[PDB]
């Protein structure tokens, strides 16, 4: 369906870790589970919570970065573009 995407394997593993089921999702669902993954694994900086530290995490491998800021999402969106198969 046009509003769905198919996450590549490593990103799917991350979504499943956060409780997702299945293989295809809407972008809102992907963001929901990726946010949950970051929250429950407590990867965000406790003082500056828009900062996410993921060195050594599969998420860091996907981002090609040790950290990123939710305020400047471009690196996160670049990661999604490379890891979401669309129609």
């Amino acid at each position: 369906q046009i509003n769905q995407v198919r996450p590549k394997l490593p990103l799917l593993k991350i979504l499943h870790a956060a409780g997702a089921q299945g293989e295809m999702f809407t972008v809102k669902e992907v963001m929901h589970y990726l946010g949950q993954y970051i929250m429950v694994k407590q990867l965000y900086d406790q003082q500056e919570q828009h900062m996410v530290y993921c060195g050594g995490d599969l998420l860091g491998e996907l981002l090609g970065r040790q950290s990123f800021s939710v305020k400047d999402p471009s690196p996160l969106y670049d990661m999604l573009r490379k890891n979401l198969v669309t129609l």
Binding site: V27, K28, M31, G35, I38, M39, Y44, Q49, H50, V52, V70, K71, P73, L76
Partner: peptide, 12 residues
Amino acid sequence: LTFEHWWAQLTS
């Protein structure tokens, strides 16, 4: 000030 506050604004 919270991760969720910032994260939630990435989607409409």
